[PDB]
Amino acid sequence: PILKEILIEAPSYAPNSFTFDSTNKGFYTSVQDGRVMKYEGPNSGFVDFAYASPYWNKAFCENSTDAEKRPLCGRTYDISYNLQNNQMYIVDCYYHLSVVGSEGGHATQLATSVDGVPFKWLYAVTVDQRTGIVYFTDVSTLYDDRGVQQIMDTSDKTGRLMKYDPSTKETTLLMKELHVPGGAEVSADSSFVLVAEFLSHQIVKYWLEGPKKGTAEVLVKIPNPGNIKRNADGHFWVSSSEELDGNMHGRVDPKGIKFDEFGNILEVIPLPPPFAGEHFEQIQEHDGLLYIGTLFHGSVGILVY
Ligand SMILES: NCCc1c[nH]c2ccccc12
């Protein structure tokens, strides 16, 4: 059991998710100061790709580490490409669900609420390449970005799972009263969606098709599960930030856990330095590489394993 690690220093801070386009050269990642950047390669580096915020601007926003800059600058928490039509969905804390074309730029806003209840902190997003439908997650109806302590203190259980349907332009609520839903992923065959409930330490399976349609059930339990991303095999990687002292201020034992559509663990990878001892967001398999997204490091981590 060998580990090779690549550390790519990013601009801004906190590259926390990734997605990949048809060309499949380099990658896209969202960062602290509101941008989604694109990595071309070593020589080429990172360039601006898109901004959720209508108002993102360089002088005021670039490389901010001030949280009271987020309401204007945005903070995007997840991005997912639609490969057939080269289009990128964005979920941003402050500018909610939007999309951008191949060309990047400021995103076009697509939804700010469901069932009359405004989104407070959109978090996870995924495109079902077969249907073109978008599944995403809102972590709270009360607290945003700068309210994490409250989320933990009240043990907030107002999270939501929605679908967006490009063709009808309709947002549909699929589940409510989720326990901090920090990850969501669609199955390869479009039959079910998975959501990680952070404070419940569980992956939940929601059926899109078949006799169990419209119903959910606990698929597997994992300590402090974050982002979930499907790989080419149709399996699922999720981040596990095991809080061994039962809260964010004690020891953390972060692992990437790969599982399958039947709740079987296939793989457990404990994170090496520098992610060891600390929470992380996402582990994503792509082309034999494992991308590590975090909310506290200034570098992309990639594991070869
Ligand atoms: N970082 C692992 C998951 C996580 C951390 N902070 C969160 C806040 C809300 C939801 C999930 C998270």
Tab-separated table of C-alpha atoms and ligand atoms in Angstrom:
chain	number	residue	atom	x	y	z
A	1	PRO	CA	0.000	0.000	0.000
A	2	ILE	CA	2.113	2.933	-1.521
A	3	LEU	CA	1.202	6.694	-1.587
A	4	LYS	CA	2.456	9.148	-4.114
A	5	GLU	CA	1.288	12.776	-3.461
A	6	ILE	CA	1.140	15.792	-5.763
A	7	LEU	CA	0.695	19.203	-4.239
A	8	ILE	CA	-0.331	22.001	-6.623
A	9	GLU	CA	-0.330	25.450	-5.081
A	10	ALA	CA	-3.523	27.271	-5.993
A	11	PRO	CA	-4.350	30.992	-6.191
A	12	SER	CA	-6.666	32.260	-3.503
A	13	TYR	CA	-7.064	29.545	-0.892
A	14	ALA	CA	-9.079	26.459	-0.168
A	15	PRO	CA	-9.682	24.593	-3.453
A	16	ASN	CA	-12.501	22.501	-2.210
A	17	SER	CA	-14.009	20.777	-5.318
A	18	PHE	CA	-13.283	19.712	-8.799
A	19	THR	CA	-14.919	18.949	-12.063
A	20	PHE	CA	-13.679	18.104	-15.544
A	21	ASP	CA	-14.745	18.891	-19.085
A	22	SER	CA	-15.065	16.875	-22.349
A	23	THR	CA	-11.521	17.776	-23.482
A	24	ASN	CA	-10.440	16.388	-20.189
A	25	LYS	CA	-7.221	18.474	-19.975
A	26	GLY	CA	-6.561	19.970	-16.550
A	27	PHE	CA	-9.414	20.654	-14.129
A	28	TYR	CA	-11.696	23.145	-12.538
A	29	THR	CA	-11.740	24.097	-8.920
A	30	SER	CA	-13.586	26.533	-6.714
A	31	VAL	CA	-11.706	28.678	-4.200
A	32	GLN	CA	-12.035	30.990	-1.235
A	33	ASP	CA	-12.308	34.349	-3.025
A	34	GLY	CA	-15.350	33.493	-5.143
A	35	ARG	CA	-13.704	32.341	-8.360
A	36	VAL	CA	-13.814	29.041	-10.151
A	37	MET	CA	-10.362	28.691	-11.692
A	38	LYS	CA	-9.123	26.361	-14.349
A	39	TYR	CA	-5.815	24.549	-14.235
A	40	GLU	CA	-4.356	24.196	-17.724
A	41	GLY	CA	-1.158	22.300	-16.692
A	42	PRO	CA	2.307	22.939	-15.132
A	43	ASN	CA	3.720	25.397	-17.684
A	44	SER	CA	0.353	27.051	-18.100
A	45	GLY	CA	-0.880	27.353	-14.482
A	46	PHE	CA	-4.286	28.550	-13.284
A	47	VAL	CA	-6.532	31.085	-14.966
A	48	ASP	CA	-9.847	32.626	-14.085
A	49	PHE	CA	-12.765	30.640	-15.473
A	50	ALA	CA	-16.035	31.720	-13.890
A	51	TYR	CA	-17.569	33.789	-11.059
A	52	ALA	CA	-20.951	33.061	-9.443
A	53	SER	CA	-21.221	36.652	-8.314
A	54	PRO	CA	-22.440	39.345	-10.728
A	55	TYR	CA	-20.197	41.635	-8.728
A	56	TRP	CA	-16.973	39.777	-8.447
A	57	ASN	CA	-14.205	42.224	-9.059
A	58	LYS	CA	-10.460	42.018	-8.776
A	59	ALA	CA	-9.359	44.892	-6.481
A	60	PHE	CA	-11.893	44.104	-3.773
A	61	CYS	CA	-12.268	40.280	-4.134
A	62	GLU	CA	-9.036	38.641	-5.309
A	63	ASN	CA	-7.277	36.581	-2.603
A	64	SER	CA	-9.581	37.851	0.097
A	65	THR	CA	-9.481	35.956	3.283
A	66	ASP	CA	-12.167	38.045	4.916
A	67	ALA	CA	-15.444	36.262	5.404
A	68	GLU	CA	-17.352	39.513	5.500
A	69	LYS	CA	-16.374	39.844	1.835
A	70	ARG	CA	-18.371	36.765	0.837
A	71	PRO	CA	-21.841	38.263	0.504
A	72	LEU	CA	-20.625	40.301	-2.492
A	73	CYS	CA	-17.781	38.164	-3.819
A	74	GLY	CA	-19.558	34.820	-3.399
A	75	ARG	CA	-18.116	31.492	-2.283
A	76	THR	CA	-18.813	28.565	-4.579
A	77	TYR	CA	-19.006	25.168	-2.858
A	78	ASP	CA	-19.370	22.778	-5.781
A	79	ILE	CA	-19.229	22.707	-9.615
A	80	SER	CA	-20.234	19.976	-12.041
A	81	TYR	CA	-19.852	19.795	-15.809
A	82	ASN	CA	-22.558	18.723	-18.274
A	83	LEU	CA	-20.350	16.899	-20.734
A	84	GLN	CA	-22.721	16.569	-23.726
A	85	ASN	CA	-23.291	20.351	-23.942
A	86	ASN	CA	-20.057	21.643	-22.399
A	87	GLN	CA	-21.790	23.558	-19.563
A	88	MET	CA	-20.936	23.988	-15.936
A	89	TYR	CA	-23.363	24.047	-13.046
A	90	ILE	CA	-22.399	26.023	-9.995
A	91	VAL	CA	-23.841	26.071	-6.486
A	92	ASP	CA	-22.683	29.124	-4.534
A	93	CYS	CA	-23.463	30.006	-0.903
A	94	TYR	CA	-24.584	33.536	-1.740
A	95	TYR	CA	-25.608	33.373	-5.393
A	96	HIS	CA	-27.164	29.863	-5.203
A	97	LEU	CA	-27.622	27.660	-8.249
A	98	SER	CA	-26.321	28.966	-11.516
A	99	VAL	CA	-24.708	27.837	-14.779
A	100	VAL	CA	-22.019	28.928	-17.183
A	101	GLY	CA	-21.075	28.125	-20.771
A	102	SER	CA	-17.840	26.700	-22.146
A	103	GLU	CA	-16.519	30.221	-22.237
A	104	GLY	CA	-16.765	30.957	-18.502
A	105	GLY	CA	-17.522	34.425	-17.138
A	106	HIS	CA	-20.166	35.542	-14.612
A	107	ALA	CA	-22.727	32.723	-14.115
A	108	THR	CA	-26.439	32.823	-15.085
A	109	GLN	CA	-28.635	32.317	-12.010
A	110	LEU	CA	-31.094	29.429	-12.192
A	111	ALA	CA	-32.780	29.072	-8.770
A	112	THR	CA	-32.813	30.793	-5.413
A	113	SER	CA	-35.507	28.836	-3.599
A	114	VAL	CA	-37.928	25.901	-3.488
A	115	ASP	CA	-41.487	25.677	-2.138
A	116	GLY	CA	-41.350	29.373	-1.183
A	117	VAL	CA	-38.335	28.817	1.086
A	118	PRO	CA	-35.172	30.565	-0.022
A	119	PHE	CA	-31.866	28.648	-0.119
A	120	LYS	CA	-29.405	29.652	2.663
A	121	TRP	CA	-26.300	27.587	1.832
A	122	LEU	CA	-26.218	25.471	-1.331
A	123	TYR	CA	-23.421	22.960	-1.097
A	124	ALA	CA	-23.270	19.969	-3.399
A	125	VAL	CA	-24.150	19.597	-7.019
A	126	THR	CA	-24.192	16.936	-9.668
A	127	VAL	CA	-25.271	16.462	-13.255
A	128	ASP	CA	-26.859	13.222	-14.294
A	129	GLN	CA	-25.294	12.995	-17.737
A	130	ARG	CA	-28.061	10.701	-18.996
A	131	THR	CA	-31.102	12.812	-18.101
A	132	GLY	CA	-29.375	16.203	-17.948
A	133	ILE	CA	-31.052	16.680	-14.598
A	134	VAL	CA	-29.249	18.467	-11.801
A	135	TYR	CA	-29.308	17.273	-8.194
A	136	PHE	CA	-28.163	19.514	-5.369
A	137	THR	CA	-28.234	20.155	-1.736
A	138	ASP	CA	-28.843	23.042	0.683
A	139	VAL	CA	-27.229	22.627	4.094
A	140	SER	CA	-29.588	24.871	6.004
A	141	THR	CA	-32.594	27.116	5.868
A	142	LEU	CA	-31.231	29.212	8.785
A	143	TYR	CA	-27.433	29.468	8.652
A	144	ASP	CA	-24.925	30.231	5.946
A	145	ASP	CA	-21.125	30.112	5.488
A	146	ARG	CA	-20.320	32.291	8.423
A	147	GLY	CA	-22.623	30.385	10.761
A	148	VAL	CA	-20.943	26.965	11.071
A	149	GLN	CA	-20.629	27.169	14.825
A	150	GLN	CA	-24.439	27.676	15.073
A	151	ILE	CA	-25.062	24.762	12.692
A	152	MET	CA	-23.092	22.524	15.135
A	153	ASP	CA	-24.408	24.142	18.319
A	154	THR	CA	-28.116	23.771	17.312
A	155	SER	CA	-27.410	20.508	15.517
A	156	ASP	CA	-29.204	22.028	12.618
A	157	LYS	CA	-31.531	19.590	10.795
A	158	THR	CA	-33.143	21.723	8.099
A	159	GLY	CA	-31.055	20.560	5.099
A	160	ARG	CA	-32.690	19.928	1.722
A	161	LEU	CA	-32.247	17.877	-1.477
A	162	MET	CA	-33.595	19.336	-4.735
A	163	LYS	CA	-33.568	18.550	-8.403
A	164	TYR	CA	-33.314	21.120	-11.194
A	165	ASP	CA	-34.588	20.197	-14.640
A	166	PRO	CA	-33.018	22.250	-17.469
A	167	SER	CA	-35.712	21.414	-19.997
A	168	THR	CA	-38.721	22.402	-17.734
A	169	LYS	CA	-36.694	25.018	-15.809
A	170	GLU	CA	-38.331	23.633	-12.649
A	171	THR	CA	-36.845	23.144	-9.188
A	172	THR	CA	-38.342	20.264	-7.256
A	173	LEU	CA	-37.791	19.511	-3.568
A	174	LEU	CA	-36.960	15.836	-2.965
A	175	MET	CA	-36.089	15.620	0.720
A	176	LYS	CA	-36.282	18.058	3.651
A	177	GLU	CA	-35.087	17.968	7.292
A	178	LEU	CA	-31.679	16.609	6.380
A	179	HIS	CA	-28.935	16.625	9.019
A	180	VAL	CA	-26.393	18.981	7.331
A	181	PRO	CA	-26.369	17.406	3.814
A	182	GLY	CA	-22.753	18.094	2.702
A	183	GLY	CA	-22.588	15.697	-0.246
A	184	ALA	CA	-24.867	14.334	-3.006
A	185	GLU	CA	-24.229	12.086	-6.022
A	186	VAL	CA	-26.306	10.468	-8.776
A	187	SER	CA	-25.904	6.763	-9.717
A	188	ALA	CA	-24.458	5.771	-13.078
A	189	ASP	CA	-27.773	4.290	-14.082
A	190	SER	CA	-29.943	7.247	-12.939
A	191	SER	CA	-31.962	5.114	-10.594
A	192	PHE	CA	-31.036	6.735	-7.271
A	193	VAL	CA	-29.375	9.742	-5.599
A	194	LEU	CA	-27.124	9.534	-2.544
A	195	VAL	CA	-26.815	12.258	0.109
A	196	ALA	CA	-24.343	12.413	2.984
A	197	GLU	CA	-25.924	13.643	6.218
A	198	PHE	CA	-22.927	15.046	8.067
A	199	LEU	CA	-24.236	15.143	11.657
A	200	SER	CA	-25.927	11.737	11.277
A	201	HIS	CA	-22.877	9.956	9.964
A	202	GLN	CA	-24.802	8.295	7.213
A	203	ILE	CA	-25.179	7.980	3.462
A	204	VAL	CA	-28.827	8.026	2.527
A	205	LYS	CA	-30.185	6.575	-0.764
A	206	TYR	CA	-33.121	8.286	-2.464
A	207	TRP	CA	-34.770	6.359	-5.308
A	208	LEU	CA	-35.479	8.091	-8.560
A	209	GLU	CA	-36.787	4.901	-10.361
A	210	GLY	CA	-38.341	1.463	-9.657
A	211	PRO	CA	-40.912	0.381	-7.013
A	212	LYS	CA	-39.151	2.120	-4.119
A	213	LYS	CA	-39.508	5.487	-5.983
A	214	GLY	CA	-39.879	8.615	-3.844
A	215	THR	CA	-38.531	6.723	-0.769
A	216	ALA	CA	-35.259	6.981	1.117
A	217	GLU	CA	-33.246	4.525	3.274
A	218	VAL	CA	-29.916	4.464	5.127
A	219	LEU	CA	-27.372	2.961	2.787
A	220	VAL	CA	-24.267	2.863	4.991
A	221	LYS	CA	-22.855	4.659	7.944
A	222	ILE	CA	-19.631	6.609	7.864
A	223	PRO	CA	-18.176	9.031	10.491
A	224	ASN	CA	-18.656	12.696	9.457
A	225	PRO	CA	-19.270	12.213	5.707
A	226	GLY	CA	-18.726	15.112	3.303
A	227	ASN	CA	-18.755	15.386	-0.501
A	228	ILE	CA	-19.576	12.253	-2.526
A	229	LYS	CA	-18.303	11.795	-6.069
A	230	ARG	CA	-19.002	8.832	-8.437
A	231	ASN	CA	-16.090	7.320	-10.382
A	232	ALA	CA	-15.948	5.657	-13.805
A	233	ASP	CA	-16.598	2.262	-12.246
A	234	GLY	CA	-19.872	3.570	-10.824
A	235	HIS	CA	-18.593	3.419	-7.310
A	236	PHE	CA	-18.587	6.293	-4.802
A	237	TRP	CA	-15.880	8.159	-2.910
A	238	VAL	CA	-16.764	10.167	0.146
A	239	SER	CA	-14.663	12.072	2.596
A	240	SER	CA	-14.765	10.948	6.165
A	241	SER	CA	-13.557	13.430	8.749
A	242	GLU	CA	-13.854	11.260	11.840
A	243	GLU	CA	-14.147	13.645	14.827
A	244	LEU	CA	-12.736	11.320	17.490
A	245	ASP	CA	-13.736	13.690	20.271
A	246	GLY	CA	-17.233	14.243	18.893
A	247	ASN	CA	-16.835	17.863	17.699
A	248	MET	CA	-14.808	19.958	15.335
A	249	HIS	CA	-12.246	21.181	17.913
A	250	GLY	CA	-10.781	17.815	18.933
A	251	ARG	CA	-8.712	15.282	16.951
A	252	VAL	CA	-9.698	14.462	13.394
A	253	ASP	CA	-8.782	11.283	11.574
A	254	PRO	CA	-9.595	11.997	7.898
A	255	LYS	CA	-10.092	9.131	5.439
A	256	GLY	CA	-11.405	8.662	1.960
A	257	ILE	CA	-13.922	5.866	1.763
A	258	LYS	CA	-14.991	4.211	-1.433
A	259	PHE	CA	-18.244	2.334	-1.484
A	260	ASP	CA	-20.755	0.786	-3.844
A	261	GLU	CA	-24.424	0.942	-4.651
A	262	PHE	CA	-25.184	-1.666	-1.958
A	263	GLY	CA	-23.387	0.009	0.934
A	264	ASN	CA	-20.238	-2.128	0.844
A	265	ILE	CA	-16.929	-0.505	1.795
A	266	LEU	CA	-14.336	-1.202	-0.923
A	267	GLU	CA	-11.425	0.940	0.145
A	268	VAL	CA	-10.275	3.127	3.042
A	269	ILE	CA	-7.452	5.614	2.549
A	270	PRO	CA	-6.169	7.635	5.489
A	271	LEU	CA	-4.964	11.033	4.292
A	272	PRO	CA	-1.236	11.792	4.476
A	273	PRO	CA	0.422	15.064	5.504
A	274	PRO	CA	-0.541	17.797	5.009
A	275	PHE	CA	-4.177	16.763	5.303
A	276	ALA	CA	-3.648	14.407	8.205
A	277	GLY	CA	-5.161	15.474	11.492
A	278	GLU	CA	-7.744	17.745	9.847
A	279	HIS	CA	-11.176	17.945	8.213
A	280	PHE	CA	-11.516	17.715	4.489
A	281	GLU	CA	-14.234	18.130	1.907
A	282	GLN	CA	-13.894	15.936	-1.141
A	283	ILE	CA	-11.986	13.053	-2.544
A	284	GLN	CA	-12.625	12.559	-6.314
A	285	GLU	CA	-11.292	9.818	-8.586
A	286	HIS	CA	-10.408	10.882	-12.088
A	287	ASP	CA	-8.088	9.112	-14.496
A	288	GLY	CA	-6.486	6.999	-11.741
A	289	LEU	CA	-5.879	10.120	-9.618
A	290	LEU	CA	-7.441	11.110	-6.321
A	291	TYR	CA	-8.222	14.802	-5.981
A	292	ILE	CA	-8.348	16.156	-2.423
A	293	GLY	CA	-10.461	19.207	-1.729
A	294	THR	CA	-10.205	20.995	1.565
A	295	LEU	CA	-11.438	24.241	3.208
A	296	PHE	CA	-8.130	25.037	4.933
A	297	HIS	CA	-5.208	24.260	2.664
A	298	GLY	CA	-3.684	26.457	-0.021
A	299	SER	CA	-2.793	23.573	-2.359
A	300	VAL	CA	-4.648	21.006	-4.480
A	301	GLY	CA	-3.735	17.501	-3.264
A	302	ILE	CA	-3.744	14.619	-5.686
A	303	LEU	CA	-3.048	11.026	-4.570
A	304	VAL	CA	-1.778	8.221	-6.880
A	305	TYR	CA	-2.365	5.030	-4.853
B	1	LIG	N1	-15.453	19.035	6.057
B	1	LIG	C1	-16.179	17.762	6.010
B	1	LIG	C2	-17.675	18.033	5.869
B	1	LIG	C3	-18.012	19.418	6.405
B	1	LIG	C4	-17.171	20.232	7.021
B	1	LIG	N2	-17.797	21.355	7.349
B	1	LIG	C5	-19.055	21.282	6.946
B	1	LIG	C6	-20.106	22.170	7.045
B	1	LIG	C7	-21.337	21.819	6.526
B	1	LIG	C8	-21.509	20.588	5.917
B	1	LIG	C9	-20.453	19.699	5.822
B	1	LIG	C10	-19.228	20.058	6.342
